[PDB]
Design an enzyme around this catalytic site. Structure first.
Site, PDB file in Angstrom:
ATOM      1  N   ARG A  57     -12.437  29.402 -51.056  1.00 21.91           N
ATOM      2  CA  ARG A  57     -13.421  28.437 -51.532  1.00 21.91           C
ATOM      3  C   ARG A  57     -14.056  28.878 -52.856  1.00 21.91           C
ATOM      4  O   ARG A  57     -13.935  30.025 -53.252  1.00 21.91           O
ATOM      5  CB  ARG A  57     -14.493  28.227 -50.488  1.00 21.91           C
ATOM      6  CG  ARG A  57     -14.169  27.180 -49.406  1.00 21.91           C
ATOM      7  CD  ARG A  57     -15.238  27.293 -48.312  1.00 21.91           C
ATOM      8  NE  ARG A  57     -15.376  28.688 -47.832  1.00 21.91           N
ATOM      9  CZ  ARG A  57     -16.357  29.560 -48.148  1.00 21.91           C
ATOM     10  NH1 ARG A  57     -17.392  29.243 -48.960  1.00 21.91           N
ATOM     11  NH2 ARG A  57     -16.318  30.777 -47.615  1.00 21.91           N
ATOM     12  N   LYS A 205     -14.824  22.731 -44.936  1.00 21.69           N
ATOM     13  CA  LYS A 205     -16.151  23.288 -44.990  1.00 21.69           C
ATOM     14  C   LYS A 205     -17.142  22.316 -45.582  1.00 21.69           C
ATOM     15  O   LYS A 205     -18.314  22.403 -45.332  1.00 21.69           O
ATOM     16  CB  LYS A 205     -16.132  24.600 -45.761  1.00 21.69           C
ATOM     17  CG  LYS A 205     -15.299  25.715 -45.037  1.00 21.69           C
ATOM     18  CD  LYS A 205     -15.751  25.971 -43.600  1.00 21.69           C
ATOM     19  CE  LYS A 205     -15.321  27.412 -43.058  1.00 21.69           C
ATOM     20  NZ  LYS A 205     -16.057  27.746 -41.829  1.00 21.69           N
ATOM     21  N   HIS A 224     -21.391  27.972 -36.800  1.00 23.01           N
ATOM     22  CA  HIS A 224     -20.202  28.608 -37.349  1.00 23.01           C
ATOM     23  C   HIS A 224     -19.680  29.579 -36.288  1.00 23.01           C
ATOM     24  O   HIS A 224     -20.000  30.793 -36.256  1.00 23.01           O
ATOM     25  CB  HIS A 224     -20.506  29.274 -38.732  1.00 23.01           C
ATOM     26  CG  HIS A 224     -19.292  29.816 -39.423  1.00 23.01           C
ATOM     27  ND1 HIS A 224     -19.323  30.920 -40.256  1.00 23.01           N
ATOM     28  CD2 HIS A 224     -17.996  29.429 -39.375  1.00 23.01           C
ATOM     29  CE1 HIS A 224     -18.100  31.191 -40.687  1.00 23.01           C
ATOM     30  NE2 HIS A 224     -17.278  30.284 -40.193  1.00 23.01           N
ATOM     31  N   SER A 242     -16.552  35.387 -42.140  1.00 21.79           N
ATOM     32  CA  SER A 242     -15.112  35.232 -42.288  1.00 21.79           C
ATOM     33  C   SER A 242     -14.435  36.568 -42.058  1.00 21.79           C
ATOM     34  O   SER A 242     -14.853  37.577 -42.655  1.00 21.79           O
ATOM     35  CB  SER A 242     -14.774  34.803 -43.729  1.00 21.79           C
ATOM     36  OG  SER A 242     -13.385  34.563 -43.840  1.00 21.79           O
ATOM     37  N   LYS A 246     -13.510  35.450 -35.120  1.00 22.65           N
ATOM     38  CA  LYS A 246     -13.766  34.213 -34.306  1.00 22.65           C
ATOM     39  C   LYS A 246     -12.456  33.549 -33.855  1.00 22.65           C
ATOM     40  O   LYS A 246     -12.270  33.268 -32.670  1.00 22.65           O
ATOM     41  CB  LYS A 246     -14.657  33.195 -35.034  1.00 22.65           C
ATOM     42  CG  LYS A 246     -16.019  33.713 -35.597  1.00 22.65           C
ATOM     43  CD  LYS A 246     -16.798  32.568 -36.273  1.00 22.65           C
ATOM     44  CE  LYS A 246     -16.148  32.094 -37.570  1.00 22.65           C
ATOM     45  NZ  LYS A 246     -16.139  33.134 -38.660  1.00 22.65           N
ATOM     46  N   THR A 247     -11.526  33.351 -34.790  1.00 21.28           N
ATOM     47  CA  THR A 247     -10.234  32.741 -34.472  1.00 21.28           C
ATOM     48  C   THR A 247      -9.387  33.681 -33.597  1.00 21.28           C
ATOM     49  O   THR A 247      -8.839  33.278 -32.567  1.00 21.28           O
ATOM     50  CB  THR A 247      -9.479  32.304 -35.799  1.00 21.28           C
ATOM     51  OG1 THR A 247     -10.274  31.332 -36.470  1.00 21.28           O
ATOM     52  CG2 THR A 247      -8.082  31.691 -35.535  1.00 21.28           C
ATOM     53  N   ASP A 261     -13.867  27.479 -34.824  1.00 17.78           N
ATOM     54  CA  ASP A 261     -14.663  27.599 -36.080  1.00 17.78           C
ATOM     55  C   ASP A 261     -16.011  26.846 -36.217  1.00 17.78           C
ATOM     56  O   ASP A 261     -16.985  27.393 -36.805  1.00 17.78           O
ATOM     57  CB  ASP A 261     -13.794  27.236 -37.308  1.00 17.78           C
ATOM     58  CG  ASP A 261     -14.344  27.834 -38.605  1.00 17.78           C
ATOM     59  OD1 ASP A 261     -14.508  29.078 -38.667  1.00 17.78           O
ATOM     60  OD2 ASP A 261     -14.645  27.070 -39.548  1.00 17.78           O
ATOM     61  N   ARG A 325      -3.116  31.943 -44.789  1.00 15.27           N
ATOM     62  CA  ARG A 325      -3.631  31.084 -43.693  1.00 15.27           C
ATOM     63  C   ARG A 325      -2.519  30.277 -43.155  1.00 15.27           C
ATOM     64  O   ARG A 325      -1.522  30.103 -43.850  1.00 15.27           O
ATOM     65  CB  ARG A 325      -4.730  30.125 -44.172  1.00 15.27           C
ATOM     66  CG  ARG A 325      -6.048  30.828 -44.566  1.00 15.27           C
ATOM     67  CD  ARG A 325      -7.015  31.032 -43.388  1.00 15.27           C
ATOM     68  NE  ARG A 325      -8.234  31.691 -43.845  1.00 15.27           N
ATOM     69  CZ  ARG A 325      -9.362  31.819 -43.146  1.00 15.27           C
ATOM     70  NH1 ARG A 325      -9.465  31.260 -41.956  1.00 15.27           N
ATOM     71  NH2 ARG A 325     -10.429  32.473 -43.651  1.00 15.27           N
TER      72      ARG A 325
HETATM   73  N1  LIG Z   1     -10.827  44.517 -33.639  1.00 17.72           N
HETATM   74  C1  LIG Z   1     -10.506  43.348 -34.220  1.00 17.72           C
HETATM   75  N2  LIG Z   1     -11.033  42.187 -33.779  1.00 17.72           N
HETATM   76  C2  LIG Z   1     -10.710  41.020 -34.366  1.00 17.72           C
HETATM   77  N3  LIG Z   1      -9.890  40.902 -35.404  1.00 17.72           N
HETATM   78  C3  LIG Z   1      -9.299  41.994 -35.986  1.00 17.72           C
HETATM   79  C4  LIG Z   1      -9.594  43.314 -35.393  1.00 17.72           C
HETATM   80  N4  LIG Z   1      -8.897  44.229 -36.106  1.00 17.72           N
HETATM   81  C5  LIG Z   1      -8.203  43.559 -37.070  1.00 17.72           C
HETATM   82  N5  LIG Z   1      -8.428  42.227 -37.016  1.00 17.72           N
HETATM   83  C6  LIG Z   1      -7.856  41.243 -37.960  1.00 17.72           C
HETATM   84  O1  LIG Z   1      -9.015  40.663 -38.605  1.00 17.72           O
HETATM   85  C7  LIG Z   1      -8.845  39.267 -38.879  1.00 17.72           C
HETATM   86  C8  LIG Z   1      -9.859  38.427 -38.089  1.00 17.72           C
HETATM   87  O2  LIG Z   1      -9.837  37.155 -38.720  1.00 17.72           O
HETATM   88  P1  LIG Z   1     -10.197  35.760 -37.965  1.00 17.72           P
HETATM   89  O3  LIG Z   1      -9.191  34.779 -38.485  1.00 17.72           O
HETATM   90  O4  LIG Z   1     -10.297  36.041 -36.503  1.00 17.72           O
HETATM   91  O5  LIG Z   1     -11.709  35.644 -38.532  1.00 17.72           O
HETATM   92  P2  LIG Z   1     -12.710  34.387 -38.491  1.00 17.72           P
HETATM   93  O6  LIG Z   1     -14.015  34.975 -38.047  1.00 17.72           O
HETATM   94  O7  LIG Z   1     -11.980  33.383 -37.627  1.00 17.72           O
HETATM   95  O8  LIG Z   1     -12.755  33.968 -40.065  1.00 17.72           O
HETATM   96  P3  LIG Z   1     -13.052  32.486 -40.777  1.00 17.72           P
HETATM   97  O9  LIG Z   1     -14.472  32.117 -40.474  1.00 17.72           O
HETATM   98  O10 LIG Z   1     -12.728  32.763 -42.255  1.00 17.72           O
HETATM   99  O11 LIG Z   1     -12.152  31.500 -40.128  1.00 17.72           O
HETATM  100  C9  LIG Z   1      -7.395  38.991 -38.505  1.00 17.72           C
HETATM  101  O12 LIG Z   1      -6.607  39.249 -39.685  1.00 17.72           O
HETATM  102  C10 LIG Z   1      -7.114  40.010 -37.394  1.00 17.72           C
HETATM  103  O13 LIG Z   1      -5.701  40.186 -37.103  1.00 17.72           O
HETATM  104  O1  LIG Z   2     -18.182  36.886 -47.020  1.00 17.41           O
HETATM  105  C1  LIG Z   2     -17.796  36.731 -45.768  1.00 17.41           C
HETATM  106  O2  LIG Z   2     -17.498  37.812 -45.109  1.00 17.41           O
HETATM  107  C2  LIG Z   2     -17.637  35.371 -45.075  1.00 17.41           C
HETATM  108  C3  LIG Z   2     -18.643  34.294 -45.382  1.00 17.41           C
HETATM  109  O3  LIG Z   2     -19.503  34.454 -46.357  1.00 17.41           O
HETATM  110  C4  LIG Z   2     -18.711  32.994 -44.565  1.00 17.41           C
HETATM  111  O4  LIG Z   2     -17.916  32.596 -43.624  1.00 17.41           O
HETATM  112  O5  LIG Z   2     -19.697  32.219 -44.875  1.00 17.41           O
HETATM  113 MG   LIG Z   3     -11.316  31.558 -38.310  1.00 11.89          MG
HETATM  114 MN   LIG Z   4     -15.106  29.778 -40.874  1.00 15.43          MN
END
Ligand SMILES: Nc1ncnc2c1ncn2[C@@H]1O[C@H](COP(=O)(O)OP(=O)(O)OP(=O)(O)O)[C@@H](O)[C@H]1O
Ligand SMILES: O=C([O-])CC(=O)C(=O)O
Ligand SMILES: [Mg+2]
Ligand SMILES: [Mn+2]
Length: 526
Positions: A57, A205, A224, A242, A246-247, A261, A325
């Site tokens: 973004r 977003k 979020h 991020s 979460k995912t 998300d 992604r």
């Molecule tokens: N202990 C852990 N727990 C969770 N994820 C991990 C860990 N160690 C490594 N990772 C890696 O970290 C990343 C977690 O990203 P994820 O897509 O879950 O984040 P998100 O919170 O969903 O982000 P966004 O809000 O951008 O969607 C992945 O690349 C995952 O494989």
């Molecule tokens: O910088 C980061 O780690 C992610 C972030 O700001 C968001 O999801 O708003």
């Molecule tokens: Mg995610």
């Molecule tokens: Mn997100």
């Protein structure tokens, strides 16, 4: 056609309304396409595209029109209420920006995708997305809720997103803007304009930000977070910034996924805004994340990954971006809530954080005051080198339209009424200088959800004053106290102290109210 003309878009000859998945597949693989439109087929059966110069973004190009509808409600970047991307825009320069996009889209073949943002008829937006790039249409078809044929027949747009990615704004210096790019929102005309950036996350977003504005003004948490539900009917939500998990961690084969998300929380419970999931693929492991991996197949859309000449994917290759992604419709995950992505009230609330200082423990059960304090703090960190902090209010300040306290207030209310408990999980780093494993983190999430953690013997970690267990089912005991991962507890303390001062200095802006002044005692104390 004349309906498009009503939006300001003229001379549209070819209109692709509600493109099917099969049409979008053949559009993307058209061998005559040039530049960032082009897709390539991978061996996993999914099309891969390049999102262009923008691979994430652009918060610095995000503007919101300041008019009488938004003036006194919005959390504005310039009104001294603590640091955000909601930068004010005049109606006049809005009109210029609308001319640029509508002219770009004029005389083009257009895709028009109708969708919902929000699972409930009652609070959902009816969004009409207009794009000239097939994979962008594909992205919104994946990430938003795909209407019935009967919903399509009565469809009345509440919000219009016009994606003019190919156009740029020559007048931006004159207009006091950041660049020739723009992600602008008008709450009077109910529209998002996108110029210059191709990146699909801007629509996702963008509508999330609109929900974050509209929902809490009617008493509904807008969050979020990930969410899933156990066979028992127990709902968990997982907040975090991020890359915090979460995912990754809500895709748990034992539980049914609500979403990864964006969720709201009303009188009936937690509901997903979206119709898909947007997974990170950097260094993706089939073995560590089999459900996410197996979702990547025809109708998934890969972004910015490197595809070898033979169709295979180098997932480890971050040279275009680290933010590689895949989007997929949510039903590419086998165990999900259906036909509607919603469930009851959350009883478990997890704050995920990736602590690059290596200070915070893998898990602690938070007090009700720590829960607020940590919610408003919104901490994560990165190894940018060089541990770099981010404090992002409500674990997602970038998408916040109202003041952070307005999100805190409504979450607490929802939490209080469900008897919910909150938990802080460091999915990041140890004194090993390595990230704790996905495997240990999954077992920590089980222990939170099955009640093991609540019934564990705990002691207080100094400085942050966090209740941590002495042991957990399925977890290596050594990692639980973050002091064990350094040569001596004094090496952890050195880091704890630096981190605490960051939190202290960050929280100061909240101390201008009673309540907030009172939360400081819930914070880390030197
Ligand atoms: N202990 C852990 N727990 C969770 N994820 C991990 C860990 N160690 C490594 N990772 C890696 O970290 C990343 C977690 O990203 P994820 O897509 O879950 O984040 P998100 O919170 O969903 O982000 P966004 O809000 O951008 O969607 C992945 O690349 C995952 O494989
Ligand atoms: O910088 C980061 O780690 C992610 C972030 O700001 C968001 O999801 O708003
Ligand atoms: Mg995610
Ligand atoms: Mn997100």
């Amino acid at each position: 056609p004349q309906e498009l003309e009503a939006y300001g878009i003229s001379d549209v000859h070819d209109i692709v309304y509600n493109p099917s998945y099969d049409l979008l597949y053949q559009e993307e693989l058209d061998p005559s396409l040039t530049g960032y439109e082009r897709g390539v087929l991978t061996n996993l059966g999914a099309v891969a595209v390049d999102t262009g110069i923008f691979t994430g973004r652009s918060p610095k190009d995000k503007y919101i029109v300041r008019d009488d509808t938004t003036r006194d409600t919005f959390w504005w970047a310039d009104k001294g209420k603590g640091k955000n991307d909601n930068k004010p825009l005049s109606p006049e320069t809005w009109q210029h920006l609308k001319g640029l996009v509508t002219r770009q889209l004029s005389g083009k073949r257009l895709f028009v995708v109708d969708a919902f943002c929000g699972a409930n008829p009652d609070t959902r937006l009816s969004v009409r997305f207009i794009t000239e790039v097939a994979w962008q249409a594909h992205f919104v078809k994946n990430m938003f809720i795909r209407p019935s044929d009967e919903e399509l027949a009565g469809f009345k747009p509440d919000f219009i997103v016009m994606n003019g990615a190919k156009c740029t704004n020559p007048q931006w210096k004159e207009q006091g803007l950041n660049s020739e790019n723009f992600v602008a929102f008008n709450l009077t005309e109910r529209m998002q304009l996108i110029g210059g950036t191709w990146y699909g996350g801007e629509m996702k977003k963008g509508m999330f930000s609109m929900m974050n504005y509209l929902l809490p003004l009617k008493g509904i948490a807008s969050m979020h977070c990930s969410a899933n539900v156990g066979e028992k009917g127990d709902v968990a939500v997982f907040f975090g910034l991020s890359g915090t998990g979460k995912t990754t961690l809500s895709t748990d084969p034992k539980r049914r996924l609500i979403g990864d998300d964006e969720h709201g929380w009303d009188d009936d419970g937690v509901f997903n805004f979206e119709g898909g999931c947007y997974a990170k693929t950097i260094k993706l492991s089939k073995e560590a994340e089999p459900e996410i991996y197996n979702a990547i197949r025809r109708d998934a859309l890969l972004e910015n990954v490197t595809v070898r000449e033979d169709g295979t994917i180098d997932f480890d290759d971050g040279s275009k971006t680290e933010n590689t992604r895949v989007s997929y419709p949510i039903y590419h995950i086998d165990n999900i809530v259906k036909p509607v992505s919603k469930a009851g009230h959350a009883t478990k609330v997890i704050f995920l954080t990736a602590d690059a200082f290596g200070v915070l423990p893998p898990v602690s059960r938070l007090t009700a005051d720590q829960t607020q304090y940590h919610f408003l703090s919104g901490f994560t960190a990165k190894l940018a080198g060089e541990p770099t902090p981010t404090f992002s209010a409500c674990f997602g300040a970038a998408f916040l339209s109202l003041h952070p306290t307005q999100y805190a207030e409504v979450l607490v209310k929802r939490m209080q009424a469900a008897g919910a408990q909150a938990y802080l999980v460091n999915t990041g780093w140890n004194g090993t200088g390595k990230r704790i494993s996905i495997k240990d983190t999954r077992a920590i999430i089980d222990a939170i959800l099955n009640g093991s953690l609540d019934n564990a013997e705990t002691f207080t970690l100094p400085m942050f004053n966090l209740a941590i267990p002495t042991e957990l089912p399925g977890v290596d005991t050594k990692i639980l106290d973050p002091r064990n991962t350094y040569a001596s507890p004094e090496q952890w303390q050195e880091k704890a102290e630096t981190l605490a001062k960051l939190f202290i200095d960050n929280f100061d802006k909240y101390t201008d109210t009673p309540a907030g002044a009172a939360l400081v005692a819930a914070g880390p104390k030197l």
